[PDB]
Amino acid sequence: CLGHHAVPNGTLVKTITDDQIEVTNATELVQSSSTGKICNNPHRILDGIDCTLIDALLGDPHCDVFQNETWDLFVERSKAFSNCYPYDVPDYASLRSLVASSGTLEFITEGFTWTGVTQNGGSNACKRGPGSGFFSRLNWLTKSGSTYPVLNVTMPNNDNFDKLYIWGIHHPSTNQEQTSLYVQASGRVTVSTRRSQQTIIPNIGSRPWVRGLSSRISIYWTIVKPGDVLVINSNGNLIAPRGYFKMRTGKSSIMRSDAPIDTCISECITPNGSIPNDKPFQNVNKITYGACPKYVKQNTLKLATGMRNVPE
Amino acid sequence: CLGHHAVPNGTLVKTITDDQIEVTNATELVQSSSTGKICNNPHRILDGIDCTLIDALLGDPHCDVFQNETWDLFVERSKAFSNCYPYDVPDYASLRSLVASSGTLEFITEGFTWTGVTQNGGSNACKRGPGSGFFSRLNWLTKSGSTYPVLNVTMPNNDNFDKLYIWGIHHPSTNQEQTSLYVQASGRVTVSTRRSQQTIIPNIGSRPWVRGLSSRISIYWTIVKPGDVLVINSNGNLIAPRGYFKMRTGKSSIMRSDAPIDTCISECITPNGSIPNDKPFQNVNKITYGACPKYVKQNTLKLATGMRNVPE
Amino acid sequence: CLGHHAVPNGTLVKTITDDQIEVTNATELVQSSSTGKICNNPHRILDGIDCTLIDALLGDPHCDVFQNETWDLFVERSKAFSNCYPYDVPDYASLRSLVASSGTLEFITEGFTWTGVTQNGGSNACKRGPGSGFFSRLNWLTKSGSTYPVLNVTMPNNDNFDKLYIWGIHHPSTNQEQTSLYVQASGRVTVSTRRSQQTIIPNIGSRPWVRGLSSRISIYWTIVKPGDVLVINSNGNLIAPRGYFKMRTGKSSIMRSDAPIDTCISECITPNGSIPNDKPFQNVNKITYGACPKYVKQNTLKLATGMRNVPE
Amino acid sequence: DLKSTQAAIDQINGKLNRVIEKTNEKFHQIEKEFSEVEGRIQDLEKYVEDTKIDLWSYNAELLVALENQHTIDLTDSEMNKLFEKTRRQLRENAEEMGNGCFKIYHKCDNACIESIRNGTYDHDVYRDEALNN
Amino acid sequence: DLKSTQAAIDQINGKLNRVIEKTNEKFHQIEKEFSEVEGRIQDLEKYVEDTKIDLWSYNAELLVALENQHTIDLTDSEMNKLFEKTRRQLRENAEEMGNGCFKIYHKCDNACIESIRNGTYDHDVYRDEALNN
Amino acid sequence: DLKSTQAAIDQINGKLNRVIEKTNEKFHQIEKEFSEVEGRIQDLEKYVEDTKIDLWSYNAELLVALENQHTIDLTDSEMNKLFEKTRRQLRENAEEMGNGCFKIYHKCDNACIESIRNGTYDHDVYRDEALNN
């Protein structure tokens, strides 16, 4: 007859002259469903089962299997928790995005010389095995017998890459445990490069009981560029580092998702799972990784690939 | 002849190939004028003649006619003023938008027990009639003879809706009127629910003279959800509540406008008045209420409904 | 034959149905190159060779040739430096944009009466000639013999334009030079109009050595509107003004550029030079002066002015 | 006098408590202001993101609308073209009913339909029976 | 010594005044910075709103422009179509003047205009007088 | 007792040092927070500018695309129109090869090309040799 046989299934399409008209054939332009699983190909996915990035960085005793983990995309679960000395990080999101975008947990140990103090402090809230323990990348120094001299140490950077140092400060609970751990009635930590400096002083006070402790630890970091030098001065309440992490630049990020991991192939990853990328648009999430399609607010956008469904 | 007779009045229209051409007939797509009056149908308009929302909430003596007023849109005039004890509200805009969006001034009085103090304090700057007065929703407690004990009261919420409590604190002017009104040399107010707490301490000092007073009042509010409880502890400088307002959710808002009110019918309301909604665009105000047309920056946008005005 | 002879040079054009197709003729719509020189016509360009706007305002001894300079566009070079008393400006960008947009450096001297002090203080870091000197628009007052009374001066504004006053405060280095320059052990400067007030107190301390000095000067400004009055009260560490600049309103701005100046004609000026304005788009800089074309992120946008290059 | 010294101690302790509580309440105010400014920046970010999303979505909607309009226009134009072609070659054998479809008055084998589909048709062999039907 | 105690009182009072004025000026600086940051956020909000308004207005302008272009194109195309149809049926009786209008050389009653408007016309009954005029 | 007064001096000096260091560290925290908020506003400004630039550039891209589409459509439509006109006037002398070009079977002087270009042509004078070639 005229060319189209008035198919029983109509296809409503959005135009600019009219609003919604009927055409013979139409195609969908928005992928709006997910498989439910996170492909592990060809990207390198690391599953942070019960640990966050900072706990796997510090050396929590139950994610000591994550030493020198190399990821292309870190997946963070919501069931993660900490089981060591209670701590605190000023500018937590900045450090989390800095370590997420680095892509490595490679830790080179360095030889610091702490003379006049006792090294390798432990805690009964951070049991490593059957005995007391602590974080694996830090060194808790206390008084040696009856005194605590002013530690003053230096470390130059002669290589051609940046070094990331992680240190901390100890906030005690009472005024008896300050002088019983650091003979000085007040502590102070100064960390200096050739172009910057950070000085912190412990804040004695009481805190909520957490896992059996009312003291705290504050975590700080420093970046040393090639050709610089680092000097650390202190007279108490210092959680020293043991070395440096190697800093890289590339394509890496982090994503919170509770989806399992399978062995498929997909180029985009959202917290809902992997999505195909044959269509130009998607309506799943505005947080995306890889060569994904752009996030729109509309659900069904149909593109006509034929003629009208009715004459006249 | 050819179809169009070259009408004497030209109609310039904007295109994308050319810029502005002449066509036979054209229609306007932007309503750019207002009547000057605010319809009171089918919306429920409340005219806050010389009072704002907070003064009609607190119980100012010259808007005591606004008790249990139910509005669909509150209209605020610029000639409004206050004629009671000088006060102050931290986070004024938040509370104004919270009460504006609730849509009711329904006040349920509750029985508080204040033992050891004198109730129903008054002021000569808030005359209710020929004698001294105060706000009608608050209770000013002072010392009883020679002492002011620590008030500590409780009130549980067993219903299934939220309750809004409004309280305050009194900032005196000198150190003699503090101890002559509250025997304690320093006041303190603690208000606590099962999940939050607010503690305020009066700030003794001098202020600008306002209506004959140099003291101040600060106004705070609390929200109690179903199943909770409220506890109030104090030892001076407390402006207690008398009950709670019932909190609702719906379609309500507030608008500043100095336009009169008539008995017409229109679906959109702007601070300039009611505007018809037959056209898709409007160029009057970007603040709008109802099913209004969207605000554009252009004045004249003409849509062609015919043919060109000239051949070739 | 068919109409087009399949020119040897193809012209790729961007469409919306296809992506890039070949047509016979095409024109470029984006001017993406600059001449390298800054026209001085018909705009009035002022070349701030080794001085910024603030140094030419204060009266630096090596840009004393810039007195009563009238500009339409100020060009700031990167080789500029200061060679006078080290100073400091709170809200530097605000003042820089305020003086840049005024368009004049016209300075009317006024007769202030400072009784009890010594005027015309000098410095050996601001040599004006072979001897000591200072800024040319300010007056450094010190103690007269053995005392420094409380200066309190007034100046009314009876004209019909705004007046801009520039003053400062002196921050000494030690506690001996404070009392050897101002007998008071602490200074203070109050500047008041009928509607505003600014009070500053000098901050004694040591600073980095700059050109042989460790003292500083902080620079402030005041705006007096017609009908107002200015009152200055002080008891030390005051860098007084000598008059006022006349404030205008018009078309003037400032631009950082290191391009030479020629005698051509162009209507737009960018830090790269003058650009023609025959095309609607440009891809040089988003900072522009005059009737320039808009900045896009695309480099080559071609507009078709003919037919396709191939049949079918 | 030791009493004067003790009074001095009392008043300096009073000033000490004063500055202590003053600094405390000022710091509380400052942290409150910090939090409210942080929240303001947060909602501003949210508004910016919402605006960007709306604008890009509307751009996509307009783009697909333009594409649909172009496609529909081209296809129905060429359909009308071929229909006019048929109407030209179908002069006095069948007649269009009004929906772009020709009701045929006579009967012809599939060879006639083939001749119609290839544009080589003579409506004279059956014009007689077409006028008769 | 009571003199040493009095000197200690003097110096602690000096330090007290020092920290008082220092805290005061620091708080003044802090509130000034708070105000300027508030103003910065305010003008940023204004800029965001202005940008959104401009973009939406330009979107509306482009939309109505596209609609106008489509309407004009369709109407003038169909006008040229019907004009060509008339020119076909008006072969050798009248002649177009150049503006899409036919100057008629002969006179005919309104029946001829009706026959033109219904597309059933024979330009032979008046072709003789048309060539004669 | 002078010892009690000295102990009071010691403890008030301790409190003095305490409030001094506390105010110092609080001010340090405050200036750090000021700097980070300034940086946040800075990157927000950058994001706003980037968004505006992208949107305006895409608007320009879409505008020029629409213009190109309109131009191409009009020119190729009128080209097909004139080609059909030629094909009408070129009935049985030459034949189109498939790319909108007519292969001519006979030879004619430039007068024939002129007659083609002015639309006044008789394909009968050479139809015989055209069928013969």
Ligand SMILES: *[C@@H]1O[C@H](CO)[C@@H](O)[C@H](O)[C@H]1NC(C)=O
């Ligand atoms: C309609 O379009 C789809 C595109 O996926 C195609 O597979 C299908 O064959 C089309 N239908 C017809 C009748 O051509």
Ligand SMILES: *[C@@H]1O[C@H](CO)[C@@H](O)[C@H](O)[C@H]1NC(C)=O
């Ligand atoms: C022009 O359009 C308006 C639409 O309001 C209509 O009322 C009017 O009749 C039209 N004019 C003509 C000549 O059709």
Ligand SMILES: *[C@@H]1O[C@H](CO)[C@@H](O)[C@H](O)[C@H]1NC(C)=O
């Ligand atoms: C192509 O367009 C340019 C526009 O600058 C024009 O100068 C040129 O003559 C055109 N080419 C032809 C073959 O028309």
